[PDB]
Write a protein that binds this ligand. Structure first.
Ligand code: HEM
Ligand code: HEM
Ligand code: HEM
Ligand code: HEM
Lengths: 141, 145, 141, 145
């Protein structure tokens, strides 16, 4: 559960991400697939070669969902219903994988906003991602 | 573990790592990001806030000790179980550190390298680095498995 | 995140527990300390002997907080704020411990309510316990 | 691993466990309680509801196999790593089962025993039994460790 402070930190970090959300979204997938090769099993139909237009397009999808979540920090389950549906019910993604993408996403933000990625912001972003992960892996509908 | 390819990569990059600084930043972020870990360093003084934690001299000092252990492991990449037997013993047997925590520190380590190297710490380089930390974490958790 | 079926299952199972809450609460603690001895390091000032009146009394307190949570399934953070403060801020309990206790409680319940401890009830309680665990390890202050 | 006692107790208790029955309930509860696990059992057909899961013939049959390996494992408590070597390969290398899952199953198995034996499944027995399932989870996770 996020503090009021977490919510502000998440919003601040995200404002810095701004128009690069998609790019960061794409790099993160990219880092996950490379560091954690078992995640690839979920994308048998994807071109997973380095630089894939497919991974890029998918990164934008992911980034787009995260911005949606940032905007609805007070009702994530409400905000990401369609997504749990897909991830929990449809794809049955093992929860461990969500920890791989989160890590990948922090690695990505850290490298691009070294100034902004303070320990406090790092702490709040981690919590937020744990929160989204929980919503996406829960069958509450 | 790493192939010779990867051994080389990991080794070259490491050459550029400022153990002092990275170490202190890694330990500090651990304590701030995963607050319950603070319970093991109660003796370090004030860990009240991020600022306090990051600026705690004992934290800074200990971060170095750790990274030092890391540097050594890097040298004995093919026998991490042995190189860390002693630590495994301390942390598992004496400290009773839950081994999940070993994964958290390594992960924090990777985030710090990324913050400090930017574009230099590529997806491909990170990938190699992940095997190392996984290795170190498994070697430390040895007394369990 | 709990579904409406989840909440129904929790209320009903906890309803069957009824007046034996304290007893079950005490047995869960005893099973925890015995199976996972590292848990004991959080109670150095306790007599963790067999049947300690301290354990039994603690068991009672744990059971009363769960009842309270069952009564507030829609606002755990609000309902358990004081306990979060204790466990998260003061005690700094490693979250793996919550898993050990949750397991310990489920083992207790299955053993005492075998006809009621259905695969569905089991799933719902496991989720309920993870939600409580999340609250208790979160510093939302 | 267990000592003479833990072992004997564990042993004696086991002699009363109907593998057939208990294995089907253990696997079934896994798929119900931790539903992402259904992904690995796609070929099993209908896992749509808890009833469907618990009544699925493939689930039940596969559950019995699992418990057989456990029973075997019980005969060789001395060498769990050796005894589970092939399964370790299958689960790790071919299936790619996150090791976290091995723990969930072992835990679900203990819940199942508690259910089926009530008070007879004492806190003390439960404990020796936790040792066992942790040993089995570690043997299977070997191609990770
Ligand atoms: C931060 C957590 C995540 C978020 C926000 C997220 C978001 C999304 C979005 C927005 C989509 C596309 C939905 C559409 O078609 O419009 C999607 C699809 C998908 N995601 Fe995720 N995802 C997350 C984690 C994961 C993880 C960890 C995995 C597995 C490694 C995963 C596997 C997939 C797959 C297999 C698809 C379907 C791809 C396709 O066929 O288009 N997701 N996700
Ligand atoms: C990458 C994993 C880790 C490595 C390589 C590592 C390394 C070390 C080293 C080199 C020492 C000093 C031993 C000596 O006194 O010579 C140490 C001590 C210690 N470690 Fe870590 N550590 C790791 C993870 C952790 C984690 C995650 C925790 C708990 C949150 C932890 C808790 C401690 C404590 C409490 C001490 C002793 C403090 C003292 O006695 O002054 N370690 N570790
Ligand atoms: C569902 C999970 C849990 C619940 C509902 C719970 C509940 C409680 C309650 C009601 C109290 C006493 C509050 C009062 O003073 O009125 C307490 C105290 C305490 N809890 Fe927990 N607890 C949980 C998990 C844990 C875990 C996993 C641990 C560590 C293994 C733990 C360690 C403690 C300690 C050390 C105290 C203080 C005991 C004392 O000095 O009296 N708790 N808990
Ligand atoms: C205590 C831990 C476990 C034990 C002892 C165990 C045992 C077994 C055995 C004996 C087999 C059949 C071997 C053969 O084909 O000769 C098997 C297969 C399999 N196991 Fe496990 N298992 C365990 C945990 C898991 C978990 C946690 C999962 C995934 C959630 C899993 C997924 C599978 C799958 C997908 C198959 C093959 C399905 C098929 O081809 O019919 N296992 N396991």
């Amino acid at each position: 559960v996020l503090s009021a402070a977490d919510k502000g930190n998440v919003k601040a970090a995200w404002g810095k991400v701004g128009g690069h959300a998609a790019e960061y979204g794409a790099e993160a997938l990219e880092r996950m697939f490379l560091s954690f090769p078992t995640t690839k099993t979920y994308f048998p139909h994807f071109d997973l070669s380095h630089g894939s237009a497919q991974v890029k397009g998918h990164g934008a999808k992911v980034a787009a969902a995260l911005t949606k979540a940032v905007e609805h920090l007070d009702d994530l389950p409400g905000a990401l219903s369609e997504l749990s549906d897909l991830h929990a019910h449809k794809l049955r993604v093992d929860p461990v994988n969500f920890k791989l993408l989160s890590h990948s996403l922090l690695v990505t933000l850290a490298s691009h906003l070294p100034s902004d990625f303070t320990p406090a912001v790092h702490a709040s972003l981690d919590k937020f991602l744990a929160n989204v992960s929980t919503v996406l892996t829960s069958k509450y509908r | 573990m790493l192939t010779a390819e990867e051994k080389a990569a990991v080794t070259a990059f490491w050459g550029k790592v400022k153990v002092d600084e990275v170490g202190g930043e890694a330990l500090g972020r651990l304590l701030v990001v995963y607050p319950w870990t603070q319970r093991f360093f109660e003796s370090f003084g004030d860990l009240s806030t991020a600022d306090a934690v990051m600026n705690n001299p004992k934290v800074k000092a200990h971060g170095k000790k750790v990274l030092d252990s890391f540097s050594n492991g890097m040298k004995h990449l093919d026998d991490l179980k042995g190189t860390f037997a002693a630590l495994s013993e301390l942390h598992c047997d004496k400290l009773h550190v839950d081994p999940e925590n070993f994964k958290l520190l390594g992960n924090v380590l990777v985030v710090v390298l990324a913050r400090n190297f930017g574009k230099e710490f590529t997806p491909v380089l990170q990938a190699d680095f992940q095997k190392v930390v996984a290795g170190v974490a498994n070697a430390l958790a040895h007394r369990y498995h």
